[PDB]
Symmetry: C5
Subunit: 366 residues, 5 copies
């Protein structure tokens, strides 16, 4: 992922303009090859027209240039691009929201699975490790970076996510389908065992744990669904054919004709179609947005950082359920115990922007 929200915190004079100077995850890094290809074909065709082609053939070539320029439609391709890219962006954001995150699970576990002893600590750590393991399994199924990090289940075992005995139980299961759901079933069994053993004190807490487990598992299933069910291939081919047809039309129809013929709208030759190159940037980049977001778990610069999320979730969950279990500072009175109003101070840098009348409603200025 490429984060630039710090740069665009305000609508400045040169806010979006300086974003064109970035390289990592930029339009240039995605297009420059197609840009050089389009420029190469355009320059080769222009050179052939200027030198190689006969005078007789040049009249036919320029008539074909006019014909190809008449059918260069830039408006209709904008519709198919807008709709297709909007669908791809919707899928991309929903895919990000489906990342297996264990924050809800860690909060429930640290608040419901009890015991300062070795067994309670084993319960909490194993409950969160099961969710981490199912996250790792689904992500290595869907993400190329995680798969290269965990090429085999042996890599998962050496990483500490799954144990030797859990590995034997995992491989002995007779199923031809992806087994990312297995640690979730293990989580359900372990939660039921903890409730039976009294580690979970109340019936509500067990229900809350299974509700939060099914939310986590549904996110894993949704990542599998997005991975399996692509954007329909026919629609991707339609947008690609529209864009490539328009650019093939622009390659010939926008060729610089000899001004000596005096054809209208073609009485100039700048030997570089800079406005056609700007249109190429526009439409080719608009397609490149979808081409980068269509599978957001690849190795694009703007693709999701799945390995970082795995590491963060594992470390934070272990910290929260093990070192932070029932480890609280003693209850004491805050700065505003005796104060009628509870208001924090402002720094010298924020006071002169703040201290303004508080909004009470639209109807109170009558």
């Amino acid at each position: 992922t490429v984060t630039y929200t710090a740069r665009v915190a305000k609508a400045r004079f040169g806010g979006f303009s300086k974003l064109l100077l970035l390289w990592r995850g930029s339009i240039y890094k995605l297009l420059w090859r197609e840009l050089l290809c389009f420029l190469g074909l355009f320059m080769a065709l222009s050179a052939a027209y200027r030198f190689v082609l006969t005078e007789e053939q040049k009249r036919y070539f320029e008539k074909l240039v006019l014909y190809c320029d008449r059918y260069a439609s830039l408006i209709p391709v904008s519709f198919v691009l807008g709709f297709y890219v909007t669908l791809v962006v919707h899928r991309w954001w929903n895919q990000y929201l489906s990342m297996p995150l264990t924050d809800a699970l860690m909060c429930v576990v640290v608040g419901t699975v009890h015991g300062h002893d070795e067994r309670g600590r084993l319960y909490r750590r194993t409950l969160m490790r099961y969710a981490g393991l199912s996250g790792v399994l689904i992500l290595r199924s869907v993400s190329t970076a995680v798969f290269k990090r965990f090429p085999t289940i042996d890599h998962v075992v050496e990483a500490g996510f799954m144990t030797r005995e859990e590995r034997k139980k995992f491989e002995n299961l007779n199923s031809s389908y992806n087994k990312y759901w297995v640690p979730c079933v293990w989580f359900c069994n372990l939660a039921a065992q903890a409730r039976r053993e009294g580690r979970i004190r109340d019936n509500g807490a067990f229900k809350l744990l299974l509700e939060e487990l099914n939310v986590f598992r549904s996110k894993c299933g949704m990542l599998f669904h997005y991975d399996w069910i692509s954007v329909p291939l026919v629609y991707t081919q339609v947008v690609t054919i529209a864009v490539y047809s328009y650019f093939l039309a622009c390659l010939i129809g926008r060729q610089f004709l000899d001004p000596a013929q005096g054809y209208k709208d073609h009485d100039l030759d700048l030997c570089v179609p800079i406005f056609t190159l700007l249109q190429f940037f526009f439409y080719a980049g608009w397609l490149k947005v979808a081409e980068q977001l269509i599978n957001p778990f690849g190795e694009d610069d703007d693709d999701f950082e799945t390995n970082f999320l795995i590491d963060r979730c594992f470390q934070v969950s272990m910290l929260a359920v093990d070192e932070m279990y029932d480890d609280l500072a003693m209850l004491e009175k805050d700065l505003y115990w005796d104060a009628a109003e509870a208001r924090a101070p402002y720094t010298a840098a924020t006071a002169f922007l703040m201290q303004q009348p508080s909004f009470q409603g639209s109807t109170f200025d009558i």
Copy 2:
């Protein structure tokens, strides 16, 4: 379904371009018949104009070609296509999300319906078989492939989803409506019986089972709703009439006229309207996207694999509630029991991409 998300993992130089070489579920497999039809009529009309028609009639024909070319509107049809196809894609994705999946139900059942004996195992297996049976009934009601797999309720009985006695109870019910809901009512009765018999230990667990059953059943009802309530026929006819009207206008208005008349914008004859064929690919394929997704439970290559989902759900649910019930590896300390940080290693292939500073927030680089 045609899955190609592996191919588009990155925005490559030839990423979307190579997707035009695929055949299964492609634009070509859907259009080539209409493509040959349009080319046949265009070539026949051009040949009649060149040879059969009189010189006097050819002036009238070319005037009619100019008239038909003036009304060839390619922009307005793009709007109706964009909106209609977006609605169809919304329905298509929501229909996929309505597939009867039993993962949530299997997690709740394995965590709440207890007993290593024959009766507890019968309870778990039958509870998941009821959900599987209702899934099979709704899918054979909505999917052509599942219907050809289960042409009669006898096929459902031989498949093991429903028993002889359950079949007699099923057929004896006096109702003229689809009975896909019957196994859900059986599930509710069986869950209540299990709670009464003590197989479900706590009141919360029974509530969680009925909540998850009503989610499963609502998905079945939603598939029935999508099957019954089509995209409004008037709107489908509007988009079809717009596309076919535009292509009838393009068939005549884009006819290659004799250059001897010297008509403007018609001083060339390539005997093949390749740019009109590219526009045909574009608009006809854009309509074909909706034509393929309007009923995603048919036998199109990109249609949903309902039989595979039935098989996967049945096998996985039986495995999870029967062989995985209370079958856990003993609780043991993980690799990071004594480690302050819980972090997994990286392979040689991922280390040189990873090991980058972790994102802390937009405001921490001031």
Copy 3:
């Protein structure tokens, strides 16, 4: 409703094309009157131009035709149509999802309200009859067909939805607002009474019943909201004025002028503006989609079958809570009790399409 999803199960050569041959709920049944009106005015104006008008007045008339043709904008009306029709379709689908359906309620009732005796059966039947009655009341408030089926509350009483005593309690309430909510309050009181009497065994079950009752009632309230709050009249008038203004411009601006004057783009007279008639089909039908879906509870062919849904819900709910209460086939072992894999057979018609490698993930083909 007009269901055609069986016809469009696959993207065939003549898939959408044959949908233009349907009549029930089609574009033709909605437009043919406006079509005849537009053709009548066009033909009358053309005949007046050809015969009645003087030679001197014909120059002014053809200048006015050119002027009216210059302002015939077909692109801008497409935007207002697309956005307005998308809003209407969103409201139409959300209105369908708000239909009062009692499947969730019947599942909860059959699983929570107990007793094989007359009193338990009365409890279950009356609980579902209250939800049915509130559904009937809201639907007769919003649907013309249901209102013609239940013109008075006497018709509701004779239909068996409400009793004589319930009628007296209903009419004695002092309120000037629609009383569709009354049976929901009766449901809440009856559920509380059943819990107090021990018919509902557990506290969770009572909470689940009130949660499912409030979902049912919110759907009834949402139907009332959609009925009360129309699509804003100003926006409907804007779309109607845009469409009618464009068609008034097309009626005159597309008039066939006498070729003897030699005006450009008007050197032909086919005495029938077939391309203008196709554009009429397009835009008038696009408006007709909204005109049919704006109130989906009327008597249009594609409008919702509210009476059928009332009958289905009543019959199915009574069956589920009365004849299916605790009526289960005895627990027995299924076909796959001893099988490691639980897989159903395939018919001869589906085997040669199926038996393909199961999708495991995008990253497993490296």
Copy 4:
């Protein structure tokens, strides 16, 4: 609000056309002033061109008319109008869904807060009065009509929503923010007191009451959010500038030039630009849709009837929790106690439309 869904129940020959004859909440009532202004400036400019301006200045004026007509872009403004109005309509509908309605709360209260005595009745009435009071407070904060109905908190006290003692507690709180949330905190305290006193019998019921209270309060907070956070002013200014720029271009560029000069596309003078007036209706009304819906709690004819909703909710909630508490007709057998099928009769007006085969699925006609 202007309700016309009865008129548009069917797609009739003159369905939407007769909606142009309505006045209350119509396009005419919103535009006629701007319409007269635009016509006044157009007629004054045309009269000045015809009479006051010199012959020499008229050539410059008509050149400026051609220049202003060349930049009159009607397509691009349609995009900004479509997107902006769609956003405003989304906000408008979501604002309607955020109205503080107490139906869910009344159902829970009547089903959970018990006692036929004075204290139980006081509990139920006060619990619903607290929700009503918070609704009144937020609505008088956001709605001009409710504010004019309750200009002071004294008006709230005289209306019976808040008492003298509750008023003293309300004013004594030290906070500079809107106190619409205060009755919700009172509701929580009163519910906890009722549970402690045994008026609420079960722990689940208390949880259901606090869940329904937080839904009600979130709707109040969401109304406050919509009131505070306007549609971004920059975007409103963009749409206004686009529309006004286009209409300033149309005021001059569409001026009727003298036909004596023989300028192309300007060889007529109808002294009234009726097609420009129709375009004014279109674009100005499209902007007026947003201008009316941007704040739906004002005094527009199509604005929400907040006072009516306050009255309805108060009266219905008091009726449901006080007169309908545990007031049920005795349980008796319905018309279909002995009938295998539970089906209601049809009137003579609906039988000949109904009695059609019931939809069973798409796959059952093979």
Copy 5:
């Protein structure tokens, strides 16, 4: 934020027109610098054309002006602007809905965490202070204004949100990730301790507290997600390149040519391209909407008032859980205890608008 919903309460004659006179958060405050830049380059180029350039070079310059005017496409950029700005507005509103608000938490705490003594008050205050602290941590991570208010964790400690001992526990945790989640884990531990100590009376109440805590924490996580995952940089660059390419085309192609050459569509020179300046306002402001909303936690005038929300939430939560805990006015009969109807009076200003027949349904006027 700039609130103007009071001004637009009604669709007035000069409603949106007077919004163009505002300055704070207006289009002018965002664009005037780019406006002066564009005018400066246009005037400099026009002056160079008029004076500095030779007569021979002026023919080439005006041919280049015609060439650049032919490729000035204002329609296609409208599509990319509409779609991109709609995505940005969707993200902006969802980001506002993700603000950490503690109203739901305060209602649950005041209704579930009991005790008039010092320990119960400490419990309630600390529970709400933990949620406030996590809100402050995430907001100072995402908002520039909050970061300038809390540049260090020392500022958080002096503000009273976190204590000395809580600070030592906070810093001693070994994690390289943002620790905004830590106070949520503390909340879970404190809630579990309160339930164990009997401060929370019932098991349901503890579950409701953890459910509301996970909603609060998910909102904090969602703010972190929006901060980390920007709108894809490629798409922002595409929209910026399209807008800047169009304006570079308009800078030259719309240059006022010398009328002495008699070029068509260029026979005038107003030395100021006011219609090009209006188009600049339109497109540049449309981009500025996204440029301001892309990061809504900056210091733009229309950006969210995060500091005000922190202050409001802290003060209101402390008031609700401390001064309002079990502090109720005694239960007494309301104004409508003996009244069959519960209806409030209307003021003289609202009666003559109100007192209209109540909407009962669409079907009751037959």
